[PDB]
Amino acid sequence: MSTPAVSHRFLVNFLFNNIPNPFDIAFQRISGLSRTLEVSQHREGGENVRNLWLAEQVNHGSLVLERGVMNASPLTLQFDRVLRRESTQWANVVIMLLNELSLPVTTWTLSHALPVRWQMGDLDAGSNQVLINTLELRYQDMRMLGVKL
Amino acid sequence: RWENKGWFAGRARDLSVTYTLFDRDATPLRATVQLSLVADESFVIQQSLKTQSAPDR
């Protein structure tokens, strides 16, 4: 059987409408994409032994990203504009894992992602650590691709 | 001992049954009744309690 996919190589591509060039930014800690369907349980009168689950509404999670405090990229300059309320532009994000050669084995492809939260790491006098800042986006739809679905 | 007697007379102002469980053919087999009554005693008992307080001697 083919070997499963490990989780320490990944590219992320962003495409805003403010910014003319699509840019690719390296992260440390992409959190993880959930997708819940939100059923509800109904209880019938004469039926006491089975359950009844009724499908309603697909809920998508959130894209939480982590990287170090490095030079100003086109994405930390873009969260600065949205969190100062100077723009409300959102982007189409493409996230993909890479195998041993270079090849994309799975792709996640988020749509209309909106920057909603910046979170700075701690400043501590005895710490021995890189200052990590936490970024967080809310998207509208999600569409996973690739050969390793 | 009800209000001052060993019984509570009266008529039913209100009643509400709310069946909550059933069966496959729906024999109900759970009820939760919510009674509510009024006082309405008889006239012989009310006249007897009156003569026990100041019977005009």
Short mmCIF file of all heavy atoms in Angstrom, two decimals, chain A residues 115-148:
data_model
loop_
_atom_site.label_atom_id
_atom_site.label_comp_id
_atom_site.label_asym_id
_atom_site.label_seq_id
_atom_site.Cartn_x
_atom_site.Cartn_y
_atom_site.Cartn_z
N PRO A 115 -8.81 38.20 7.22
CA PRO A 115 -8.00 38.34 8.44
C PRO A 115 -8.78 38.92 9.62
O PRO A 115 -9.27 40.05 9.56
CB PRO A 115 -6.88 39.28 8.00
CG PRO A 115 -7.34 39.91 6.77
CD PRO A 115 -8.22 38.93 6.09
N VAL A 116 -8.85 38.16 10.70
CA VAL A 116 -9.69 38.53 11.83
C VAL A 116 -8.93 38.66 13.15
O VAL A 116 -9.44 39.32 14.06
CB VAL A 116 -10.87 37.55 12.00
CG1 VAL A 116 -11.80 37.65 10.83
CG2 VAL A 116 -10.38 36.16 12.09
N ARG A 117 -7.74 38.09 13.31
CA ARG A 117 -7.08 38.16 14.61
C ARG A 117 -5.57 38.10 14.46
O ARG A 117 -5.04 37.25 13.74
CB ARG A 117 -7.56 37.02 15.52
CG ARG A 117 -6.99 37.05 16.92
CD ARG A 117 -7.62 35.98 17.76
NE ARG A 117 -7.36 34.64 17.25
CZ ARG A 117 -6.27 33.93 17.53
NH1 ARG A 117 -5.35 34.43 18.34
NH2 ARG A 117 -6.11 32.72 17.02
N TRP A 118 -4.88 39.02 15.14
CA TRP A 118 -3.44 39.00 15.33
C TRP A 118 -3.16 38.73 16.80
O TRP A 118 -3.82 39.30 17.67
CB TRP A 118 -2.81 40.34 14.97
CG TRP A 118 -1.34 40.32 14.72
CD1 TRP A 118 -0.36 40.05 15.62
CD2 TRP A 118 -0.67 40.83 13.57
NE1 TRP A 118 0.87 40.22 15.06
CE2 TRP A 118 0.70 40.73 13.80
CE3 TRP A 118 -1.11 41.34 12.35
CZ2 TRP A 118 1.65 41.10 12.86
CZ3 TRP A 118 -0.17 41.70 11.41
CH2 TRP A 118 1.19 41.58 11.67
N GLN A 119 -2.17 37.88 17.08
CA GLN A 119 -1.83 37.56 18.46
C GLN A 119 -0.32 37.47 18.57
O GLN A 119 0.29 36.62 17.93
CB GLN A 119 -2.49 36.26 18.90
CG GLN A 119 -2.13 35.80 20.29
CD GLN A 119 -2.61 36.72 21.38
OE1 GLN A 119 -1.83 37.45 21.99
NE2 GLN A 119 -3.91 36.69 21.63
N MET A 120 0.27 38.32 19.39
CA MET A 120 1.71 38.40 19.56
C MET A 120 2.17 37.47 20.68
O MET A 120 1.46 37.25 21.67
CB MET A 120 2.10 39.84 19.88
CG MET A 120 3.58 40.15 19.84
SD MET A 120 3.90 41.79 20.49
CE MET A 120 3.89 41.49 22.25
N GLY A 121 3.38 36.94 20.54
CA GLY A 121 3.98 36.12 21.57
C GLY A 121 4.45 36.93 22.77
O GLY A 121 4.40 38.16 22.79
N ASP A 122 4.93 36.21 23.77
CA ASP A 122 5.30 36.81 25.04
C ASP A 122 6.70 37.40 24.96
O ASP A 122 7.59 36.83 24.33
CB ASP A 122 5.24 35.78 26.17
CG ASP A 122 3.84 35.24 26.41
OD1 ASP A 122 2.85 35.94 26.13
OD2 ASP A 122 3.73 34.10 26.91
N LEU A 123 6.90 38.54 25.61
CA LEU A 123 8.23 39.09 25.81
C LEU A 123 8.67 38.79 27.24
O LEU A 123 8.10 39.33 28.19
CB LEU A 123 8.24 40.60 25.56
CG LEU A 123 7.92 41.01 24.12
CD1 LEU A 123 7.90 42.51 23.99
CD2 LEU A 123 8.93 40.42 23.18
N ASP A 124 9.67 37.93 27.38
CA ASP A 124 10.13 37.47 28.68
C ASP A 124 11.65 37.58 28.71
O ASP A 124 12.32 37.28 27.73
CB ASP A 124 9.70 36.02 28.92
CG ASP A 124 9.89 35.57 30.37
OD1 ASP A 124 10.32 36.38 31.22
OD2 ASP A 124 9.61 34.39 30.66
N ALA A 125 12.17 38.00 29.86
CA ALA A 125 13.59 38.32 29.97
C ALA A 125 14.46 37.07 29.98
O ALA A 125 15.54 37.06 29.38
CB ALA A 125 13.84 39.15 31.22
N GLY A 126 14.04 36.03 30.68
CA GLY A 126 14.67 34.74 30.46
C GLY A 126 13.77 33.84 29.65
O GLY A 126 12.87 33.20 30.21
N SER A 127 13.97 33.77 28.33
CA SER A 127 13.02 32.98 27.57
C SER A 127 13.65 31.99 26.59
O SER A 127 13.19 30.85 26.53
CB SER A 127 12.08 33.92 26.81
OG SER A 127 12.80 34.64 25.83
N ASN A 128 14.70 32.40 25.87
CA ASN A 128 15.35 31.62 24.80
C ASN A 128 14.35 31.10 23.77
O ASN A 128 14.20 29.89 23.57
CB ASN A 128 16.17 30.46 25.37
CG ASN A 128 17.32 30.92 26.21
OD1 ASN A 128 17.39 30.62 27.39
ND2 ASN A 128 18.22 31.67 25.61
N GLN A 129 13.68 32.02 23.08
CA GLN A 129 12.72 31.61 22.06
C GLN A 129 12.52 32.71 21.03
O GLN A 129 12.76 33.89 21.30
CB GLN A 129 11.38 31.23 22.70
CG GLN A 129 10.67 32.36 23.38
CD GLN A 129 9.42 31.90 24.07
OE1 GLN A 129 9.08 30.73 24.03
NE2 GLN A 129 8.72 32.83 24.71
N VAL A 130 12.08 32.30 19.84
CA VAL A 130 11.72 33.20 18.75
C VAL A 130 10.35 33.79 19.04
O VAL A 130 9.44 33.08 19.48
CB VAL A 130 11.74 32.43 17.41
CG1 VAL A 130 11.20 33.25 16.27
CG2 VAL A 130 13.13 32.02 17.07
N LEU A 131 10.19 35.08 18.79
CA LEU A 131 8.90 35.75 18.95
C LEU A 131 7.97 35.30 17.83
O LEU A 131 8.15 35.66 16.67
CB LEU A 131 9.10 37.26 18.94
CG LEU A 131 7.94 38.19 19.28
CD1 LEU A 131 7.48 37.95 20.69
CD2 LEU A 131 8.39 39.61 19.12
N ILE A 132 6.96 34.49 18.19
CA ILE A 132 6.01 33.91 17.25
C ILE A 132 4.73 34.73 17.31
O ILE A 132 4.21 34.99 18.40
CB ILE A 132 5.72 32.44 17.58
CG1 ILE A 132 6.99 31.60 17.53
CG2 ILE A 132 4.69 31.85 16.65
CD1 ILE A 132 7.60 31.53 16.18
N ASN A 133 4.22 35.15 16.15
CA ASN A 133 2.92 35.79 16.11
C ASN A 133 1.88 34.91 15.41
O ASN A 133 2.19 34.19 14.46
CB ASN A 133 2.99 37.20 15.49
CG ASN A 133 3.60 37.24 14.11
OD1 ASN A 133 3.89 36.22 13.50
ND2 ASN A 133 3.83 38.44 13.62
N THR A 134 0.66 34.96 15.92
CA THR A 134 -0.41 34.05 15.54
C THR A 134 -1.44 34.80 14.70
O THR A 134 -1.97 35.82 15.13
CB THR A 134 -1.09 33.45 16.77
OG1 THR A 134 -0.12 32.78 17.58
CG2 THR A 134 -2.16 32.46 16.36
N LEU A 135 -1.72 34.27 13.51
CA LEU A 135 -2.62 34.88 12.55
C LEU A 135 -3.82 33.97 12.36
O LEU A 135 -3.72 32.75 12.48
CB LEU A 135 -1.91 35.10 11.22
CG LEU A 135 -0.62 35.90 11.34
CD1 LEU A 135 0.08 35.95 10.02
CD2 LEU A 135 -0.90 37.29 11.85
N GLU A 136 -4.97 34.56 12.07
CA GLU A 136 -6.20 33.79 12.05
C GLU A 136 -7.16 34.38 11.03
O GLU A 136 -7.32 35.60 10.97
CB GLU A 136 -6.79 33.74 13.46
CG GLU A 136 -7.81 32.66 13.71
CD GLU A 136 -9.22 33.16 13.88
OE1 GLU A 136 -9.39 34.23 14.47
OE2 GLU A 136 -10.15 32.45 13.47
N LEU A 137 -7.77 33.52 10.22
CA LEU A 137 -8.59 33.90 9.07
C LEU A 137 -9.93 33.18 9.15
O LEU A 137 -9.98 32.03 9.59
CB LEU A 137 -7.93 33.51 7.76
CG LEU A 137 -6.56 34.00 7.29
CD1 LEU A 137 -6.14 33.15 6.15
CD2 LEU A 137 -6.61 35.38 6.81
N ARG A 138 -11.00 33.83 8.71
CA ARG A 138 -12.29 33.16 8.53
C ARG A 138 -12.64 33.18 7.05
O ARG A 138 -12.73 34.25 6.45
CB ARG A 138 -13.42 33.82 9.33
CG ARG A 138 -13.15 34.04 10.79
CD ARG A 138 -12.71 32.79 11.50
NE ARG A 138 -13.69 31.72 11.67
CZ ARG A 138 -14.43 31.57 12.76
NH1 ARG A 138 -14.30 32.43 13.76
NH2 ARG A 138 -15.26 30.56 12.86
N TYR A 139 -12.85 32.01 6.48
CA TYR A 139 -13.15 31.83 5.07
C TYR A 139 -14.60 31.40 4.89
O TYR A 139 -15.29 31.01 5.83
CB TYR A 139 -12.19 30.82 4.44
CG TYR A 139 -12.09 29.48 5.14
CD1 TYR A 139 -12.93 28.43 4.79
CD2 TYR A 139 -11.15 29.26 6.13
CE1 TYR A 139 -12.83 27.22 5.42
CE2 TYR A 139 -11.05 28.05 6.76
CZ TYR A 139 -11.89 27.03 6.40
OH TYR A 139 -11.79 25.82 7.03
N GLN A 140 -15.07 31.48 3.65
CA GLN A 140 -16.46 31.18 3.33
C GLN A 140 -16.67 29.74 2.87
O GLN A 140 -17.60 29.08 3.32
CB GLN A 140 -16.97 32.13 2.25
CG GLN A 140 -17.17 33.53 2.73
CD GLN A 140 -17.73 34.41 1.66
OE1 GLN A 140 -17.88 34.00 0.52
NE2 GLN A 140 -18.09 35.63 2.03
N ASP A 141 -15.82 29.24 1.98
CA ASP A 141 -15.98 27.90 1.46
C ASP A 141 -14.61 27.24 1.48
O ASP A 141 -13.59 27.90 1.68
CB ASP A 141 -16.58 27.92 0.05
CG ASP A 141 -17.16 26.60 -0.37
OD1 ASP A 141 -17.12 25.64 0.43
OD2 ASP A 141 -17.65 26.50 -1.51
N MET A 142 -14.61 25.94 1.28
CA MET A 142 -13.40 25.14 1.34
C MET A 142 -13.56 23.98 0.37
O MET A 142 -14.64 23.38 0.30
CB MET A 142 -13.15 24.67 2.77
CG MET A 142 -11.96 23.78 2.98
SD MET A 142 -12.39 22.05 2.95
CE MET A 142 -10.75 21.40 3.02
N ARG A 143 -12.51 23.67 -0.37
CA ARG A 143 -12.58 22.69 -1.44
C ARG A 143 -11.26 21.95 -1.55
O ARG A 143 -10.30 22.48 -2.11
CB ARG A 143 -12.95 23.39 -2.76
CG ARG A 143 -12.96 22.54 -3.99
CD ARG A 143 -13.89 21.37 -3.86
NE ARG A 143 -13.87 20.61 -5.09
CZ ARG A 143 -14.19 19.34 -5.19
NH1 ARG A 143 -14.51 18.66 -4.10
NH2 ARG A 143 -14.15 18.73 -6.36
N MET A 144 -11.21 20.73 -1.04
CA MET A 144 -9.97 19.96 -0.99
C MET A 144 -9.78 19.21 -2.30
O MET A 144 -10.74 18.68 -2.87
CB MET A 144 -9.94 19.00 0.20
CG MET A 144 -11.05 17.99 0.26
SD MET A 144 -10.83 16.79 1.59
CE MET A 144 -11.23 17.75 3.04
N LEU A 145 -8.54 19.18 -2.78
CA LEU A 145 -8.19 18.59 -4.07
C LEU A 145 -7.08 17.58 -3.84
O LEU A 145 -6.79 17.18 -2.72
CB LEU A 145 -7.72 19.66 -5.05
CG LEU A 145 -8.66 20.83 -5.34
CD1 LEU A 145 -7.99 21.85 -6.21
CD2 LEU A 145 -9.95 20.35 -5.96
N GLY A 146 -6.46 17.15 -4.93
CA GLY A 146 -5.26 16.35 -4.87
C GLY A 146 -5.54 14.88 -5.08
O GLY A 146 -6.68 14.45 -5.27
N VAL A 147 -4.47 14.09 -5.04
CA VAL A 147 -4.61 12.65 -5.18
C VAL A 147 -4.75 11.96 -3.83
O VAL A 147 -5.39 10.91 -3.74
CB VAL A 147 -3.44 12.07 -6.00
CG1 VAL A 147 -3.46 12.63 -7.40
CG2 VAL A 147 -2.11 12.36 -5.34
N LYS A 148 -4.18 12.53 -2.77
CA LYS A 148 -4.33 11.99 -1.42
C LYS A 148 -5.41 12.81 -0.74
O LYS A 148 -5.14 13.79 -0.05
CB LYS A 148 -3.03 12.03 -0.63
CG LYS A 148 -1.98 11.04 -1.06
CD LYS A 148 -0.80 11.09 -0.12
CE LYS A 148 0.30 10.17 -0.58
NZ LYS A 148 -0.07 8.74 -0.46
#
